[PDB]
Amino acid sequence: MQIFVKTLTGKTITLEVEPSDTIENVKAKIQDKEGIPPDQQRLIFAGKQLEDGRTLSDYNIQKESTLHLVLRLRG
Amino acid sequence: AYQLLLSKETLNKILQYKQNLEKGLATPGKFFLEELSKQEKSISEMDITTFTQLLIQSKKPQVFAESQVYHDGTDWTLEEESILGDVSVNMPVTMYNDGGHGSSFKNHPKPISGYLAYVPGALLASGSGPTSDMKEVLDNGKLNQDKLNALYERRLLPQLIHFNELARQNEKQAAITIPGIGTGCFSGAYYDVIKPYVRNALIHILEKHKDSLPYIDIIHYDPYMGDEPAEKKIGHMSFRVSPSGVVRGTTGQLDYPLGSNPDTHILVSIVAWDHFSWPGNDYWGGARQTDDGVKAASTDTMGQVTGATGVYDKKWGRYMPPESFTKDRKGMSDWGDYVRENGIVFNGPVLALDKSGKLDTLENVASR
Numbered sequence: 135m136q137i138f139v140k141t142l143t144g145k146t147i148t149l150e151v152e153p154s155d156t157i158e159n160v161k162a163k164i165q166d167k168e169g170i171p172p173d174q175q176r177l178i179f180a181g182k183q184l185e186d187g188r189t190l191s192d193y194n195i196q197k198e199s200t201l202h203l204v205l206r207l208r209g
Numbered sequence: 210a211y212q213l214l215l216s217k218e219t220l221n222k223i224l225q226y227k228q229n230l231e232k233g234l235a236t237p238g239k240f241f242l243e244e245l246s247k248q249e250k251s252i253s254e255m256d257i258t259t260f261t262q263l264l265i266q267s268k269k270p271q272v273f274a275e276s277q278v279y280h281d282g283t284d285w286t287l288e289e290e291s292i293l294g295d296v297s298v299n300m301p302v303t304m305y306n307d308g309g310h311g312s313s314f315k316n317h318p319k320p321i322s323g324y325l326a327y328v329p330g331a332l333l334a335s336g337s338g339p340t341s342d343m344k345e346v347l348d349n350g351k352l353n354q355d356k357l358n359a360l361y362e363r364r365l366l367p368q369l370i371h372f373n374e375l376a377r378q379n380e381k382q383a384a385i386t387i388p389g390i391g392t393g394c395f396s397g398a399y400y401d402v403i404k405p406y407v408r409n410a411l412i413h414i415l416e417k418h419k420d421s422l423p424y425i426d427i428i429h430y431d432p433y434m435g436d437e438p439a440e441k442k443i444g445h446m447s448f449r450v451s452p453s454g455v456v457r458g459t460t461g462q463l464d465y466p467l468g469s470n471p472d473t474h475i476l477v478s479i480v481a482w483d484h485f486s487w488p489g490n491d492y493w494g495g496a497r498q499t500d501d502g503v504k505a506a507s508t509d510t511m512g513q514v515t516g517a518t519g520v521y522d523k524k525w526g527r528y529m530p531p532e533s534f535t536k537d538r539k540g541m542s543d544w545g546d547y548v549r550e551n552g553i554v555f556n557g558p559v560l561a562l563d564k565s566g567k568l569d570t571l572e573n574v575a576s577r
């Protein structure tokens with residue numbers, strides 16, 4: 135299954151995933167292709183921010199759905 | 210309730226910016242553009258004070274200037290940033306505790322009355338491209354002491370002039386406490402080297418202008434770590450370096466330094482502020498984490514800015530919003546929520562320091 139991850143700059147990342155993958159697994163996969171530490175990633179879908187412990191299937195994220203990546207501010 | 214101050218050189222930058230805008234040669238950043246669009250005057254029809262106030266009004270209650278900004282039109286441009294970093298604000302406050310961070314604060318049995326002067330430090334960190342202050346005080350990545358000196362002189366002197374005068378009017382002297390302004394997050398890569406530069410800058414300012422500060426008596430400088438304890442005589446003034454992690458028993462930022470008391474001195478604390486935020490910054494979201502947020506939480510800063518009457522929580526060291534507000538809006542009821550519900554904006558009187566060292570209206574200083 136492929137899904138997309140769109141960043142603020144409109145750049146689009148392609149990920150290889152399974153419906154049972156957790157949002158935590160997805161963030162880890164984002165770290166692999168992009169080197170962003172997972173605890174800096176907010177993933178948005180369907181107007182919500184997504185919880186690490188739930189699955190893509192939980193959130194009804196299907197093949198070629200697009201997730202939105204927003205980085206954490208950090209002072 | 211509060212008073213915005215800025216230097217002569219900052220006024221020149223403002224006049225140049227306003228003229229560039231009037232000519233079409235610059236355009237506002239996103240946040241200033243929003244403030245412009247909510248009022249009716251064109252840039253040209255607006256006086257220099259009104260224009261300055263609208264730029265200051267584009268500040269937001271909380272912003273991390275060191276990481277959250279792009280220094281272009283999508284938030285604040287470099288030209289706006291160069292100005293906003295120079296703007297300071299003072300207010301009289303009630304001080305409910307000594308300013309101790311986290312859990313270490315000591316409540317004043319009788320809350321002290323004094324003043325805060327919020328001043329932003331040199332912004333030498335960025336989540337994107339270089340900042341205006343980096344371009345100002347760095348020579349190919351190396352700190353320039355004279356250039357840093359001129360930056361802090363620009364930003365601190367108008368407040369020293371103000372409180373020198375205010376002490377004279379109250380027939381007292383001034384005791385001023387200063388934290389490690391610009392040595393925290395703002396120092397970015399220069400963290401390990403910045404502290405002697407800031408100390409040197411404070412000394413240089415007091416030394417250069419000793420003749421104009423006869424009512425200033427005690428300067429209590431506390432960068433917490435990384436400096437040696439010292440007292441320097443600067444003219445008639447006593448400049449003290451007392452980093453709290455180095456010198457046990459050091460008096461807090463919100464308390465009278467040794468040799469001062471309320472009968473003989475007014476108490477002023479400098480607050481390490483932020484180019485783009487309201488005074489108190491992250492305490493508007495309820496965080497109590499920086500010099501900016503801790504001192505705002507420990508004073509009635511939020512009441513001075515909003516006009517509301519908060520309540521000091523002795524147990525947690527926080528000045529809380531009005532109790533009616535927290536009941537009605539529990540869950541979305543921090544001070545920044547009070548600002549939204551009440552349509553509060555940050556905008557107040559502004560003066561400039563002229564070439565002779567008098568604080569005057571922007572119009573008066575511009576015409577001289």
Ligand SMILES: *NC[C@H](*)CC(=O)OC
Nearest residue numbers: 208209275393394400
């Ligand atoms: N929020 C900025 C903090 C940066 C830092 O940790 O400087 C020491």
